[PDB]
Amino acid sequence: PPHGELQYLGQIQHILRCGVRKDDRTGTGTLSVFGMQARYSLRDEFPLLTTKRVFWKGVLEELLWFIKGSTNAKELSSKGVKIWDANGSRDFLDSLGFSTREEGDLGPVYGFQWRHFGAEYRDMESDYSGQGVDQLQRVIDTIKTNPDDRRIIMCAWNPRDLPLMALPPSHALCQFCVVNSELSCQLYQRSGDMGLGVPFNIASYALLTYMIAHITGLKPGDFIHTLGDAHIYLNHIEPLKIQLQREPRPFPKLRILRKVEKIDDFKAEDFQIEGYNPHPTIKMEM
Amino acid sequence: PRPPHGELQYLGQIQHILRCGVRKDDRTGTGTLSVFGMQARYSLRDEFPLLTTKRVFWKGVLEELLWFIKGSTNAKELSSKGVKIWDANGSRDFLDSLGFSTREEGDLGPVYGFQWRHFGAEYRDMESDYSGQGVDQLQRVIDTIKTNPDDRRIIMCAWNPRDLPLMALPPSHALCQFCVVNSELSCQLYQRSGDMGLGVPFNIASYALLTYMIAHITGLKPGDFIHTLGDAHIYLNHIEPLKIQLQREPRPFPKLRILRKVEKIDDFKAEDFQIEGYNPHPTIKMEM
Ligand SMILES: [Cl-]
Ligand SMILES: [Cl-]
Ligand SMILES: [Cl-]
């Protein structure tokens, strides 16, 4: 078969070859293309990148943490996933003028946007039951009842909430589509750290589509990844040139071990990645 | 591995839906053929992507954008300019059918114009003084381009979930993202739902135009218009007219000319724009 991974590799090539140079956040530098899209097939496999070891336990735990509606970094850290701890640091929170917020409070990030869109954020402990739009449940509801719907959209980019977030979201919006009882997802990702971020991003949304499919009684179709600003940190070029030399191996398969009724009831234990045989880990730093 | 450029992209999308699309139903009975997820890149470099395989309604494109820019949500303000495309959705019947019986006819709700200029604001009606309210996204986009051209956050939103149930229609165009590269301004549109026969050609012209405008206001050269689709659909009653469109030879895109310097985006007038070398094949009729 033609490996969907090649699209990611192809994209990294194309940026190495045609990308333009810019000044990054803090010192490094970047190579950027604007506008990309790749189609990742979800039928009888899972797009977990094989040319390097992807941190799946990160993927799964963080997704469940979004679904939990959590905005507290420690709730995820308690699971052994540290990716958001930097962002909820005492220092880091102060550096964004969040002096009054408790360590770990990330503001209205994905968990909140997904489960309580439009609600007025207070803090990471507040009860937000019945508050804001529960986009994720409405997406699930609409999928079950109206599979032709052209408006099954979940938004995480909220202009009002931006000054309040500990991290501006990479992922502006998702759109779901049903075709002959297959569920497709398209993510508009406004900023893609191609070396570090994107592989994990692909798995994350691929895993979301598996989950929503599973509860609406459908089959995973395609994940379409669309990028706005797709960048490579100079820092990643060398480890990436080596990665481009690796040959992908068949995608693993994802197992859902019990029938789950609701999106809220999923647990880590319910997911087994089978046959994940990656090439050795690559540590991107920047 | 050369990509197709200009109009062939769109002709290739059409073929793709005709050959590979899947039959789906709609709220009328007509039906569509449908594909999910496409992208095309229309160079705006010394040319303007107004389709040639059929004459496009250029005047309408132009007037509709001017209409968005001044923050109008009254279909009659556009109407009085000789462009009717929003009239139906502002009619007494369409309004009653949406539960807005208290609305004067022509009142569309918080559609593009409101969203671009007064985002986050409380929509009251179409005659209301909104100035000073909501986020002027359009002016912020221009300002950010001028002050941090490298910004990765230059997004204009129109899909507001909270405003959706007050809108005549949910927007086809969810969001725009801008990008500055080397003194060239690019724009990517996420169009959640594309009517490929009737809407898409107009849609492309529309957002290429907005790109040309903002590029001008900020002293940049237009770069690319990247068109990204969610649901790309062809209504069954357009298959035949589109089959005819596919046999036609696309001729080179026209150039767009801006005839004076303009300082603010609000000052553009219809007279500031001129399409040149527009050599389209004849109008093809497609019914909504
Ligand atoms: Cl139209
Ligand atoms: Cl002429
Ligand atoms: Cl002719």
Author numbering:
A (entry chain C): 26 to 311
B (entry chain A): 24 to 311
Please give me the paper's original passages concerning this structure:
Human thymidylate synthase (hTS) is an obligate, stable homodimer with two active sites, each including residues from both monomers. As a dimeric enzyme, it provides the sole de novo pathway to deoxythymidylate (dTMP) synthesis in human cells by catalyzing the reductive methylation of deoxyuridylate (dUMP) to dTMP using methylenetetrahydrofolate (mTHF) as the one-carbon methyl donor. By interacting with its own and other mRNAs, this protein regulates its own levels and those of other proteins involved in apoptotic processes, including bcl2, c-myc, and p53. Its inhibition is usually achieved with compounds that bind at the protein active-site, competing either with the dUMP substrate, such as 5-fluorodeoxyurdine 5’-monophosphate (FdUMP), or with the folate cofactor, such as raltitrexed (RTX) and pemetrexed (PMX) (Carreras and Santi, 1995; Jennings and Willis, 2015). Here we report the discovery of molecules that bind at the hTS monomer/monomer interface and, despite their small size, markedly shift the monomer-dimer equilibrium of the enzyme towards the inactive monomeric form.
To target the monomer-monomer interface and dissociate the hTS dimer, we applied the ‘cysteine tethering’ approach to fragment-based drug design. We selected the ‘Y202 pocket’, which accommodates the side chain of F59’ from the other monomer, as the most promising region to target. We therefore made the Y202C mutant and screened for compounds able to form a covalent disulfide bond with C202 from a library of organic disulfides. We also mutated the active site cysteine to serine to prevent the selection of compounds that bound at the active site (C195S). We made mutants with single point mutations at C195S and Y202C to test their functional and structural properties as well as the double mutant, hTS C195S-Y202C. This was used for the ligand selection according to the above-described tethering approach. As expected from removal of the catalytic C195 residue, this double mutant was inactive, but X-ray crystallography showed that it takes the active conformation of hTS. We employed the C195S-Y202C double mutant to capture compounds that, driven by some affinity for the region near residue 202, formed a covalent disulfide bond with C202. (a–c) Unbiased omit map (blue wired map contoured at 3.0 σ), showing the S,S(2-hydroxyethyl)cysteine (CME) chemical modification occurring at the mutated residue C202, and the mutated residue S195 in the hTS double mutant C195S-Y202C. Four molecules, A5, A10, A20, and TPC also bound peptide (D186-R215) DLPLMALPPSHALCQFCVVNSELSCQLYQR (sequence C), containing the engineered Y202C together with the native C199 and C210. In agreement with the described computational and crystallographic data (see above), Y202C is the most exposed of these three cysteines and is thus easily available for disulfide-bond formation with the RS fragments, being therefore suitable for tethering experiments.
